[PDB]
Amino acid sequence: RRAVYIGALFPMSGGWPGGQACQPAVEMALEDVNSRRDILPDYELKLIHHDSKCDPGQATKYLYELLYNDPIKIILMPGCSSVSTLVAEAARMWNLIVLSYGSSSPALSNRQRFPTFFRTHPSATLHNPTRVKLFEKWGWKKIATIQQTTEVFTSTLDDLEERVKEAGIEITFRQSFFSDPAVPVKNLKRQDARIIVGLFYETEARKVFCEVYKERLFGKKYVWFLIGWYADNWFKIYDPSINCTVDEMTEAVEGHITTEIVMLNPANTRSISNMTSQEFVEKLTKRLKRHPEETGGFQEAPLAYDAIWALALALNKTSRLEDFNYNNQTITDQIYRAMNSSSFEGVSGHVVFDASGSRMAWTLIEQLQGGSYKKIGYYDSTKDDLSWSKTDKWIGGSPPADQTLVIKTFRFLSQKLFISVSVLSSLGIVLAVVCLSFNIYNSHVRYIQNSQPNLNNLTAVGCSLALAAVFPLGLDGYHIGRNQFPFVCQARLWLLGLGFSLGYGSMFTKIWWVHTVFTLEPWKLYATVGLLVGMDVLTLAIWQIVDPLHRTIETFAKEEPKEDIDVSILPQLEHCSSRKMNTWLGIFYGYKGLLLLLGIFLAYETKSVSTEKINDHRAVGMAIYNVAVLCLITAPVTMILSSQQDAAFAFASLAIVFSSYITLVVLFVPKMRRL
C-alpha cells in the first residue's frame, strides 16, 4: 500500500493543555481506520505530530519545518487559537485546507478572509443566549467586564454587548490589560462595581485572583462570572511565579458562576463505527495513564474522533493522490467540492460541519460550594427550556443586587400624644354640653336678672365646635391620609374658622355694649354682630374655593442610613398648603389680632360698674385677657416651627385645652356661686 502523511500540532502545556488527552485519542483513531477495508483499499495514513504550547514562536519554527521537509504533506491539523488563526491566514499561498478542532473564535466565520477553513468545535457565542436568561431571573441592569486583549474575547464581548441591547441591560465599565493586571483591578475597586465578568487565561486567572485578594474586592456583594473548561483543581498547584497562598484563593473563589457546553450525546444510538458512547469513554480512559479528572483537555476527545472520520469519509468520496504538488488547483477544488456536500452521523450526534456553525444545542451551568463543584441546571436554546433544580446557595438565601433607595414619609406618636389629647378633650366636651343644658332649662328670675343666655349659648357653641377639632388635627397618613386628606384639612379650617369667631364675637359684643353704654339693647347690637360674623364667614369661603390647600410634600433629610443594609432612605413629610400661604395666613392673623387688641382696649377703657343687665365683667375680662395673651403667644410660633413632629401640635393642643377650661370655669362659676 502507498502511504500519505498528515501534519499535526498537539499542545501539551501552556494556557490550554489539551494534547495530553488528544494525542492518544487520534492514536486510537488511525488504528481503527486502517483496519476497515471498505474506505481505503490501497492507501495508508501516517501522522507527523509536533508540540507547540500554542506559542507563536515555536509554532512558526515548526511550521517552517513542516512546509519545507520531505516527503510532501497533505493536510495540517492545528491546535490553539493563535496558531489556528496564523495558519488559516498564511495558507492561502500554498492552496491547503485547514481543519481545526479546538478553536472557537467567532471571527473565523467571515468566509471572505478564510476560504479553506473548517472546524468541528462550536462557536463561543453560545454562552450569550444563556447569560441574558440568568440576567432576567435575578433582575439586573448594570454589569462590568474585564478581558485579555485577544480578538477571540473581543469579538465575543462585542456579540454579547450587541445582543444585550435588546433586553435593556447596558455595559457601564470596561477595562483592559496586556500582561500586568494590577492597575485595572485597583481602578475597578476604586470604581466599586458589583457584577463582574472575566475573560482571561488560566495563569492570568491565578495572577488576578491573588490580586483581588490583595484588594478585598470580594465577599458578600460581588458576583463573578467565569469560563468552564478549566481544570478541576486549577488553583491547587504550586506556582513559583506568584506570591499568594492557597487559603487566600480558597477564600477568594467561593461563590462564582461557571458555564460550559455539553459535548456528548446522552442518548443510546449506534454510530458509524459500530460503537456506543460510554464504551468509547471506557476505552479512552483505559488508554490514558493519569486520572481523567485532572488530565487536561478531556472533554474534547470525540470532536477529534469525528474530525478524523469526516475526512476519512471525504477521502472515500474523492478516492491519483500520489503526484500532488503545491501549485495545482484542480484537486484542492475537487476535494473542496467533495467536502462542502458532506453530512453524516458520527459519535457527537449528527456531524454536519457545513453550516454557519451552531449545530449543538445544550449548555451546562455550575457553581462552587465548599470546595466542591455542583451542577445547577441545563438549558436549551431553541425551545427556551430551562430545567431548574433549586440548589443555588447564596449568602443569606438570596442573591445580592447593586444598591437602592427607599422613600419614607414621617409620622409621629399615634398613641401616647394622641389618645391622651383625645381623652382630655372628651373629658371637657361633655361638661360643655351639660353646662349648656343647665343654661337651657333654668328658666329662672335671677338668671333673667343675669345676662341674656343667647350670647352665652353663642360662646358655648363656639367653644364646643372649637373643642371638637383635635380629631381632624391629630389624624395623618397613618390611617386616613390617602385621598380625602384635603377634606380633613378642610374640616380643620372650617371648625377653626367657626369656633373661634363665634365665641370671640359673643364676648366682644357684650364688651362693646358695656363700653358704649357707660359714659334699644334688645335688638341693635345682635344684628350688627351677626353681620360682622357673616363677613368673617365670607372671607374664609372666598379663598377656600378659589385657591384651596390640597397637599404638599417637603423633602430635606439626607442619604446614608448607615445601618447594616446599603439601602438609602429619603425622608419626606406631607402637609396641606396652597401655592401661597404666608400672605393670607399673615393678613388674617393680623386682621384678627387687631380686633383682639381692640377688645382688650375696650376691656381696659372701663372696668368700674355694671347695672341692670349682668355684672360678669371682671370674670369675662380676665378670661378674655387670658385667652388673648395665650393665643397671641402660641399662634406666631407654629408658623415659625416647621418641624411639626412634637412642637406645633402640642403647643396648639395645650392652648386649646387651657382656653376651653378657662372659658368653662369663668362661664359657670357664678351659677355655683348663686346656688
Binding site: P56, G57, Y64, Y68, E89, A90
Partner: protein, 690 residues
C-alpha cells in the same frame, strides 16, 4: 573583501496605499552606504543590503521571508517592517534563529513588553514618550484635577494603562475614567455632571468630529476648558472628514468655533540647533542635500529617523566585530548556520550600549527605547503652530514664548473656589433692640431717682425699702445681660468671646437670684400668716445666691466651656458666577452640658414651683397698704410662664440665629417692663394724687 548582507522588508509598488513611504526612505539609505563606501570602515569586508517586498501582507510576507531564508546567503540582522501586524508576527518568532530586528516607523505600544520581545529595537519614540513631558508641563501650570476620556483599542488602552505608572508619586489625581465604543457623549454627560475642566483624550481621527459636536451641545468649550489630544493626524483633516457625504448631525460653523485651541502632542522630525554631528555636517547640509537629492518622489517625514539608524547599525557592528579573537572570529562570522547563540549574545550586548550625537540629537537607549524629543502644537485660526519642545536627557521643557495665548486673560483653574461664611445678625434689629433696652435703662434710672427722691417720706409706707431697691437693682443688672448677649465674631476678634459667654451666665445668674429673692419675700409673709431679725431675710437670700453661685463659679472654673463651630456644606451659587459658599456657625459649650445646666434649670424650676404653690395658697391675707401681695403674684405667674416658654424656645430654635435673639430679648424686656410697671406705677399714681 568578503561581503556581509542584511535583510530588509518594505512595500515597494505603487498599487498600494502605503508604498510611497517605502519609496520615501529608499534614497536616504542610498546616501549612507556611499558615505561608508567613501570611508570603508569595514576594510577587509564589504557591506551588502538586500531588499525584498512584503506589501504588509501575512501570506506574501511569510512566503518572501521563507524564500529569503531558504535561498539566501548568511544573513545577520533584519531591518525594516512598517505594517503593524507583520512586524509583530516576525518579532514574536524571531528567537528561533537568533537575529535582531530594527524598525523605524512602528510606533505601536505592544512592542514594549520585553518579556516576549527580547530581540527587538527601534529608533523612534513611541506613544509612551509623551507621558513624562505632559506631567512636567502640569508642574508649569499647577493643574491637579484632570479627567481622561479614552477609546477601546489596544494602543489606546496601553497608553491609559501607562499613565498611572508614570503619574504615580506626585500629587495629581485622575478624577474620572470613561470608555465608549460607539456613543461617546453619554460619558461626556457624566463628565459634565462631575464638573471637570482639563481633559486628556485618546481616540482616533474618525471619532473626533462626533465628540466635539455632541460635546459642543453640552457646553464644554469657551474660555474654561483645555483639551490634550494626540497629533499624528494628517494636516487639514477636518475640512473633509466633516463633509463625509453629509454628516448633518453637526454643522461646520458651529464646530470651528467649538474646537478652538486644543493642544496636540507629537514628536519632532529634525533638530533646530547646530553642532558638529557624527557625520561631519550640519542638519541644514543634510536637509538641502536630501531636498535636491531626490528626483521626483514626494517627500516623507520618516527618512531622517532611518538615515541615522543605518549609521547606528554600522557603528554597532564595528564595535561588536573587533573582540579579542581574530582568526577564529572570522571563522565564527562565516560559519553562521543560524545556530550560534553566543554570537547573538555578543551582538545584543554590544548593541545595548551606544552613545553618540547623530542627526536627531544624542542617540541613547533605555530598555531598548530611544530617548528623543517631543513637540507641542496649538490650534489658532484653522491652523496648527509649534509652541514647545521637551528634552529627555536634560529633562527640560522649552516653550517658544511670544506665541501662546489663552481665550480669557489667564490660565484656567482646576475647580471652583470654596468660601466659608458666618451667618450674622441683622444690624437694624440689633440697633432697634439696643435702643429699646437703653430706653428701658433710662426709665430705670428715672425710677431709681424717684425711689431716692422720696426716700424719707412718711407717705411711702415706711416698709420694704431694701427689697424694692434690690428688685430694681436686679432689673437694672438684668437689662445689661440682653445688652451683652448679641455679640459677633467680627466685633470681638476672638479676644473676649471666651469670657463674655460665661459672664453672660454670671450676670444672668445674678438676675435669677434677685428675681427669686423678690419672689420669696412674698412667700415669707405668707409663711408668717400661716402660723427677731433686722436683715436676716436679706442675709438668707444672699446666702442662697452665694451658695448656688459658688456652685456655678467652681463648676465652671472646672468647666472650660469654650467656643466650637460646625458647618453645613450645601454650597449653591449666590453671586451667580462660580464661588461656592458654605455656612459655618460658632457656639460656647462644654463636655458636661446636661449635668450642670440640667441641675441649675431644675433648681430654678423648683424655686418657681414653690412660688407657684405660695401664689396658689395666698389670695387675700387682709394686708394693709404696706403690702402689695397681688401685683407680686401677677408678676410671678407671668414670669414663670414667660421663662418656661423662653426656655423651651431657646432650646429648640437652633438653626435660626435671627429669631432666638429677638425672642430672648422680647421675653426679657417685656417681662422686666411689666414687672417694674406693676410694682412701681400704683405708687406712681399715688404720688400723682399726692
Amino acid at each position: 573583501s568578503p561581503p556581509l548582507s542584511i535583510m530588509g522588508l518594505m512595500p515597494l509598488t505603487k498599487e498600494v496605499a502605503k508604498g510611497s513611504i517605502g519609496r520615501g526612505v529608499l534614497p536616504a539609505v542610498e546616501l549612507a552606504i556611499e558615505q561608508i563606501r567613501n570611508e570603508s570602515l569595514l576594510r577587509p569586508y564589504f557591506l551588502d543590503l538586500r531588499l525584498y517586498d512584503t506589501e504588509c501582507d501575512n501570506a506574501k510576507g511569510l512566503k518572501a521571508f521563507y524564500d529569503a531564508i531558504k535561498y539566501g546567503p548568511n544573513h545577520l540582522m533584519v531591518f525594516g517592517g512598517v505594517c503593524p501586524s507583520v512586524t509583530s508576527i516576525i518579532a514574536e518568532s524571531l528567537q528561533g534563529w537568533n537575529l535582531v530586528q530594527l524598525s523605524f516607523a512602528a510606533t505601536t505600544p505592544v512592542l514594549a513588553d520585553k518579556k516576549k520581545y527580547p530581540y527587538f529595537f527601534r529608533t523612534v519614540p513611541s506613544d509612551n514618550a509623551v507621558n513624562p513631558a505632559i506631567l512636567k508641563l502640569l508642574k508649569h501650570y499647577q493643574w491637579k484635577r484632570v479627567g481622561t476620556l479614552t477609546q477601546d483599542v489596544q494602543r489606546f488602552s496601553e497608553v491609559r494603562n501607562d499613565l498611572t505608572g508614570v503619574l504615580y508619586g506626585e500629587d495629581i489625581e485622575i478624577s474620572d475614567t470613561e470608555s465608549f465604543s460607539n456613543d461617546p457623549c453619554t460619558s461626556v454627560k457624566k463628565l459634565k455632571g462631575n464638573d471637570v475642566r482639563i481633559i486628556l483624550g485618546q481616540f482616533d481621527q474618525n471619532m473626533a468630529a462626533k465628540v466635539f459636536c455632541c460635546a459642543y451641545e453640552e457646553n464644554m468649550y469657551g474660555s474654561k476648558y483645555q483639551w490634550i489630544i494626540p497629533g499624528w493626524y494628517e494636516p487639514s483633516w477636518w475640512e473633509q472628514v466633516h463633509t463625509e457625504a453629509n454628516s448633518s448631525r453637526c454643522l461646520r460653523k458651529n464646530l470651528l468655533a467649538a474646537m478652538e485651541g486644543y493642544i496636540g502632542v507629537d514628536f519632532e522630525p529634525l533638530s533646530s540647533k547646530q553642532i558638529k554631528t557624527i557625520s561631519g555636517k550640519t542638519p541644514q547640509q543634510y536637509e538641502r542635500e536630501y531636498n535636491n537629492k531626490r528626483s521626483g518622489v514626494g517627500p516623507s517625514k520618516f527618512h531622517g529617523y532611518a538615515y541615522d539608524g543605518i549609521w547606528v547599525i554600522a557603528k554597532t557592528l564595528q564595535r561588536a566585530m573587533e573582540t579579542l579573537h581574530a582568526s577564529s572570529r572570522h571563522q565564527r562570522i562565516q560559519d553562521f548556520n543560524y545556530t550560534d547563540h553566543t554570537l547573538g549574545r555578543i551582538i545584543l550586548n554590544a548593541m545595548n550600549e551606544t552613545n553618540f550625537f547623530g542627526v536627531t540629537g544624542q542617540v541613547v537607549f533605555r530598555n531598548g527605547e530611544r530617548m528623543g524629543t517631543i513637540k507641542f502644537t496649538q490650534f489658532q485660526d484653522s491652523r496648527e503652530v509649534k509652541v514647545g519642545e521637551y528634552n529627555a536627557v536634560a529633562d527640560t521643557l522649552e516653550i517658544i514664548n511670544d506665541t501662546i495665548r489663552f481665550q480669557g486673560s489667564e490660565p484656567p483653574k482646576d475647580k471652583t473656589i470654596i468660601l466659608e461664611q458666618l451667618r450674622k445678625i441683622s444690624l437694624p434689629l440689633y440697633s432697634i433692640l439696643s435702643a429699646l433696652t437703653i430706653l428701658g435703662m433710662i426709665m430705670a434710672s428715672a425710677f431709681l431717682f424717684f425711689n431716692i427722691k422720696n426716700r424719707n417720706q412718711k407717705l411711702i409706707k415706711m416698709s420694704s425699702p431694701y427689697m424694692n431697691n434690690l428688685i430694681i437693682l436686679g432689673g437694672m443688672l438684668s437689662y445689661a445681660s440682653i445688652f451683652l448677649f448679641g455679640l459677633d465674631g467680627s466685633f470681638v476678634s476672638e479676644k473676649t468671646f471666651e469670657t463674655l459667654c460665661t459672664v453672660r451666665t454670671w450676670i444672668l445668674t445674678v438676675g435669677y437670684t434677685t428675681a427669686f429673692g423678690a419672689m420669696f419675700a412674698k412667700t415669707w409673709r405668707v409663711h408668717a400668716i400661716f402660723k427677731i431679725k433686722d436683715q436676716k431675710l436679706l442675709v438668707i437670700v444672699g446666702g442662697m445666691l452665694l451658695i448656688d453661685l459658688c456652685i456655678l463659679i467652681c463648676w465652671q472654673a472646672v468647666d472650660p466651656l469654650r467656643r466650637t463651630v460646625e458647618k453645613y456644606s450645601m454650597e449653591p451659587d449666590p453671586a451667580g458666577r462660580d464661588i461656592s459658599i458654605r455656612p459655618l456657625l460658632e457656639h460656647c459649650e462644654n463636655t458636661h452640658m446636661t449635668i450642670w445646666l440640667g441641675i441649675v434649670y431644675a433648681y430654678k424650676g423648683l424655686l418657681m414651683l414653690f412660688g407657684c404653690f405660695l401664689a396658689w395658697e395666698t389670695r387675700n391675707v387682709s394686708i394693709p397698704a404696706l403690702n402689695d401681695s397681688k401685683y407680686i403674684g401677677m408678676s410671678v405667674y407671668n414670669v414663670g410662664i414667660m421663662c418656661i416658654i423662653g426656655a423651651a424656645v431657646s432650646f429648640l430654635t437652633r438653626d435660626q440665629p435671627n429669631v432666638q435673639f429677638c425672642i430672648v430679648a422680647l421675653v426679657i424686656i417685656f417681662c422686666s417692663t411689666i414687672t417694674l410697671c406693676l410694682v412701681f406705677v400704683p405708687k406712681l399714681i399715688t404720688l400723682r394724687t399726692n
